[PDB]
């Protein structure tokens, strides 16, 4: 409590309490789920509707043609990170002319978040990103943390009620590598359904040859069964 002053302050236990507060800010975001097959990767999430007549706040974003990120936490910080990631993809498609690897984007966003947590006067991004990419590296899923680190996953859940989604993913973890695009999307939607408190769920799906695309609302009806 007394050491929860800055992101630059270590608590006597080695913990950065402001970093942990930002991580909790991510854990307070709406349920986000990511999956990874040998051919496709999926990010889905129950978008948040602050008001009854307000639309669901977009949660899935397309960083590059085969890269997308699902934000969980401060959506403004998520948009800032999306801007940064799109700049990184545009400078990798400028310097090298090809699409960056989602692993490199995870590295860059982790570096930026760590620099936010290592210099005073900066706050960790209050948003965690489930980034799915596809390329020469294959489909890859990364959960980037406010602390400045990204964890590579075959599946993952973050935000609120994400323990049920994590349990579902653990149960079906060995199914995912062979799951087709349609089956991976179905698994994503059925991991989110366990988190239900659809027109709220937005799902970005990418493949090795399939460019990243965002499906929302009725477009996902075919993947419920």
């Amino acid at each position: 409590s007394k050491y929860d002053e800055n992101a630059t302050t270590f608590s006597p236990e080695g913990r950065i309490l402001q970093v942990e507060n930002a991580m909790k800010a991510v854990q307070q975001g709406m349920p986000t789920v990511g999956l990874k097959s040998k051919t496709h990767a999926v990010i889905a999430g129950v978008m948040h509707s602050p008001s009854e007549f307000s639309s669901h706040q977009p949660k899935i974003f397309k960083i590059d043609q085969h890269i997308g990120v699902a934000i969980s936490g401060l959506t403004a910080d998520g948009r800032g990170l999306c801007k940064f990631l799109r700049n990184e993809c545009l400078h990798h498609t400028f310097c090298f002319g090809t699409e960056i690897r989602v692993a490199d984007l995870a590295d860059t966003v982790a570096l930026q978040s760590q620099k936010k947590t290592s210099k005073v006067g900066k706050r960790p991004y209050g948003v965690g990103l489930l980034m799915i990419g596809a390329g020469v590296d294959g489909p890859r899923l990364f959960e980037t943390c406010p602390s400045g680190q990204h964890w590579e996953y075959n599946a993952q859940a973050i935000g609120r009620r994400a323990q049920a989604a994590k349990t579902y993913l653990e149960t079906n973890l060995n199914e995912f590598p062979d799951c087709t695009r349609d089956q991976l999307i179905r698994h994503a939607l059925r991991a989110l359904n366990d988190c239900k408190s659809l027109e709220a769920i937005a799902l970005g799906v990418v493949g090795i040859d399939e460019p990243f695309t965002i499906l929302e609302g009725p477009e996902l009806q075919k993947y419920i069964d």
Binding site: Q28, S51, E52, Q57, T75, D77, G121, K122
Partner: protein, 234 residues
Amino acid sequence: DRNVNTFSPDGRLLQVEYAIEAVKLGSSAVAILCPEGVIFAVEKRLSSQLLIASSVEKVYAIDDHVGVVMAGLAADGRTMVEHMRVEAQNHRFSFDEPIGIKAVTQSVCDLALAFGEGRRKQMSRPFGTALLVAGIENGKCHLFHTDPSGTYTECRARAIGGGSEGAEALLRDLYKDGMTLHEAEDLALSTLRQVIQEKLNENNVEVACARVSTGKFEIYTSEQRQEIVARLPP
């Protein structure tokens, strides 16, 4: 804590939540979207009759097609609407088209959370203003809500300010997706009148319509505000 960009143990930006509270201390404003247009009805707080009402305008025309109503700190809202106007004219200059409502909303939101402290030379605190951005894009009226946190959401109906929660509760069973612009104006003014502490009058209210038929965000004159307040059931 003690620094602006600090997260509570609950995972909230304390300055952001306090700016949300500041918005809750601002004048009420109801934005009702209907297929014909988006209608703002705003409580103009007049501490005296000597206060020129037109000068405490809580409604700002960002561009011909897009407008904005503030709730909270009028000066922070002035900064936000200035940024939005510059963004709209820059977009017209760069792409020869009106800026999308979502686009300008996202730009001002990106501006909103860029506050910082402790680093050598930027704003030092979040904007204590929530905007109801609305306008006509591609023959469609779009209504967006920005709050100090920098998050924006598209809204069919929204309320910002002191009566925001009560106004939303009243809108629960009063708002429908197919209302006419007449009905949208009536609902906005009724909700505002219900969530203000003074009798509604053309002088203490500011009404503005992003009208699809005209494709433009206009601000209603005293005559139009009277034309709406007359129709109200009270």
